[PDB]
Structures are given as structure tokens and as C-alpha cells.
Amino acid sequence: VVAAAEKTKTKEGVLYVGSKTKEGVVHGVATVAEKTKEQVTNVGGAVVTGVTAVAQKTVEGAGSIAAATGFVK
Amino acid sequence: VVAAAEKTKTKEGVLYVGSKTKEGVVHGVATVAEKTKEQVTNVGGAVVTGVTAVAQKTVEGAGSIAAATGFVK
Amino acid sequence: VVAAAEKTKTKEGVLYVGSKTKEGVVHGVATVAEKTKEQVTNVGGAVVTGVTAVAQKTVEGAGSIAAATGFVK
Amino acid sequence: VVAAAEKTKTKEGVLYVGSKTKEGVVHGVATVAEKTKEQVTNVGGAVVTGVTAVAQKTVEGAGSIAAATGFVK
Amino acid sequence: VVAAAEKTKTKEGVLYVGSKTKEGVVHGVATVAEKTKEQVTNVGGAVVTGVTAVAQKTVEGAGSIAAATGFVK
Numbered sequence: 519v520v521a522a523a524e525k526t527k528t529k530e531g532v533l534y535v536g537s538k539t540k541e542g543v544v545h546g547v548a549t550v551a552e553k554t555k556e557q558v559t560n561v562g563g564a565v566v567t568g569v570t571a572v573a574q575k576t577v578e579g580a581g582s583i584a585a586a587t588g589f590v591k
Numbered sequence: 592v593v594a595a596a597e598k599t600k601t602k603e604g605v606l607y608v609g610s611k612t613k614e615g616v617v618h619g620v621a622t623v624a625e626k627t628k629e630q631v632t633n634v635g636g637a638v639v640t641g642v643t644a645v646a647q648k649t650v651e652g653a654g655s656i657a658a659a660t661g662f663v664k
Numbered sequence: 665v666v667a668a669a670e671k672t673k674t675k676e677g678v679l680y681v682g683s684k685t686k687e688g689v690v691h692g693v694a695t696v697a698e699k700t701k702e703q704v705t706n707v708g709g710a711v712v713t714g715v716t717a718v719a720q721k722t723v724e725g726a727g728s729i730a731a732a733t734g735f736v737k
Numbered sequence: 738v739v740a741a742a743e744k745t746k747t748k749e750g751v752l753y754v755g756s757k758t759k760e761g762v763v764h765g766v767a768t769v770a771e772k773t774k775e776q777v778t779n780v781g782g783a784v785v786t787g788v789t790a791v792a793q794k795t796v797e798g799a800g801s802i803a804a805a806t807g808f809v810k
Numbered sequence: 811v812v813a814a815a816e817k818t819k820t821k822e823g824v825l826y827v828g829s830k831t832k833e834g835v836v837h838g839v840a841t842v843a844e845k846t847k848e849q850v851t852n853v854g855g856a857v858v859t860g861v862t863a864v865a866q867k868t869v870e871g872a873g874s875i876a877a878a879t880g881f882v883k
């Protein structure tokens with residue numbers, strides 16, 4: 519499991535957000551197990567979780583994610 | 592499990608957020624187990640979790656995530 | 665499990681946030697176990713968790729995360 | 738488990754936050770176990786947890802996190 | 811478990827925060843065990859936990875975290 523990222527090197531990248539919420543519940547990244555023998559979970563990269571959610575220019579550079587999730591029996 | 596990142600080297604990158612919430616519950620990253628024999632969990636990279644959530648220019652440089660999540664029996 | 669990061673080397677990177685919340689509960693990163701034999705958990709990288717949450721220019725440099733989470737039996 | 742970071746070398750990096758909260762509960766990073774035989778937990782990198790939470794330019798330099806979390810039986 | 815960091819070498823890095831909270835409870839980093847045989851926990855890097863929380867330019871230099879958390883039986 520290898521990840522390699524290389525980077526070699528008027529409004530830009532500008533954001534405006536206004537949010538109004540009376541009641542927000544947000545769970546993000548959740549793993550829940552009830553009575554379960556094996557759970558294997560991987561979350562990789564960018565997760566944005568909002569009642570209001572904005573992602574802008576998330577990977578302007580090089581981004582690499584490598585995952586190997588699992589079991590051997 | 593190897594990750595390598597290399598970086599070699601008017602408004603830009605400017606954000607404005609206004610948020611109003613009467614009641615917020617936010618869970619971020621959560622692993623919950625109840626009565627479970629094995630749980631294996633990996634969270635990698637950037638997680639933003641908000642009632643209002645903004646990510647801007649998260650990986651302008653090189654970003655690498657490598658994960659190996661699991662069990663051998 | 666090896667991570668290597670290398671870096672070699674008008675408003676920019678400017679943010680404004682206003683937040684108003686009457687009641688906030690925020691859990692960040694949580695692992696909860698109740699009656700569970702094995703829990704293995706890894707959280708890596710940047711987690712931002714807010715009723716209002718902003719991440720800007722999180723990895724302008726090189727960022728590397730390597731994780732190996734798990735069990736051998 | 739080895740991590741190596743190398744760094745070799747108008748408003749910039751400027752932030753303004755105003756927050757007003759009547760009631761805040763924030764948990765940060767929490768591991769809770771009740772009646773659990775084994776818990777293994779790793780939290781790495783930057784976690785920001787707020788009713789209002791801002792991360793800006795978290796890794797302008799090189800950042801490396803390596804984790805090996807788990808058990809051998 | 812080895813971590814190595816090397817560093818070789820108009821407003822910049824300027825922040826303004828105003829916060830008003832009537833009631834704040836903040837838990838930071840917490841490990842709680844009740845009736846649990848084994849808990850192994852590692853928290854590494856920077857955790858900022860606030861009713862209002864700001865992290866700016868957390869790792870302008872090189873930062874390395876290496877963790878090996880776990881048990882051998």
C-alpha cells in the first residue's frame with residue numbers, strides 16, 4: 519500500500535458562505551458496530567460534512583490515496 | 592504501508608463564512624462498538640465536520656495517504 | 665509504516681469567520697466501546713470538527729500519512 | 738513506524754474569527770471504554786475541535802505521520 | 811518508532827479572535843475506562859479543543875509524528 523505525491527513548481531480561490539440553521543445534527547465519519555464479529559473500515563481523503571458544506575479546490579496539488587482494507591483468514 | 596509526498600518550488604485563497612445556528616450537535620469522527628468482538632478502523636486525510644463546514648485548498652501541496660487496515664487470522 | 669514528506673523552496677490565505685450559536689455540542693474524534701473484546705482505531709491527518717468548521721490551505725506543504733491498523737492472531 | 742519530514746528553504750496567513758455561543762460542550766479527542774477487554778487507539782496529526790473551529794495553513798511545511806496501531810496475539 | 815524532522819533555512823501569520831460564551835465545558839484529550847481490562851491509547855500531534863478553537867500555521871516547519879500503539883500477547 520504505497521501512495522506517492524509529487525508537486526514541482528482578480529480573485530482566485532475565493533469563497534463566501536452564509537449559513538443559518540436553527541437545528542443541526544451532523545455525523546461526520548462514523549463506524550458503528552452492534553453485536554458484530556469483524557468490522558474493517560477505512561476512510562481516506564477529504565470528507566467534508568456539514569449542514570452546509572463547501573469544498574473548494576480540494577486537490578490543487580498532487581493527491582494520492584492508497585488503501586488496502588480487509589482480512590485474511 | 593508507505594506514503595511519500597514531495598513539494599519542490601488580487602485575492603487568492605480568501606474565504607468569508609458567516610454562520611448562525613441555534614442548536615448544533617456535531618460528531619466528527621466516531622467509532623462506536625457495542626458487544627462487538629473485533630473492530631478495526633482507520634480514518635485518514637482531512638475530515639471537516641461542521642453544522643457549517645468549509646474546506647478550501649486542502650492539498651495545494653503534495654498529499655499522500657496510505658492505509659492498510661485489517662486483520663490476519 | 666513509513667511516511668516521508670519533503671518540501672524544498674493582495675490578500676493570500678486570508679479568512680474571516682463569524683459564528684453565532686446558542687447551543688453547541690461537538691464530539692471531535694471519539695472511540696467508544698461498550699462490552700467489546702477488541703477495538704483498534706487510528707485517526708490520522710487533520711480533523712476539524714465544529715458547529716462551524718473551517719479548514720483552509722491544510723496541506724500547502726507536503727503531507728504524508730501512513731497507517732497500518734489491525735490485528736494479527 | 739518511521740516518519741521523516743524535511744523542509745529546505747499584502748496580507749498572507751491572516752485570519753479573523755468572531756464567535757458567540759451561549760452554551761458550548763466540546764469533547765476534543767476521546768476514547769471511552771466500558772466493560773471492554775482490549776481497546777487500542779491512535780490519534781495523530783492535528784485535530785481542531787470547536788463549537789467554532791478554524792484550521793488555516795496546517796502544514797505549510799512538510800508533515801509526516803506514521804502509525805501502526807494494533808495487537809498481535 | 812522513529813520520527814525525524816529537519817528544517818534548513820504586510821501582515822503574515824496574523825490572527826484576530828473574539829469569543830463570547832456564557833457557558834463552556836471543554837474536554838481536551840480524554841481517555842476514560844470503566845471496568846475495562848486493557849486500554850492502550852496514543853494521542854500525537856497538535857490537538858486544539860475549544861468552544862472557539864483556532865489553529866493557524868501549525869506546522870510551518872517540518873513535523874513528524876510516529877506512533878506504535880498496541881499490545882503483544
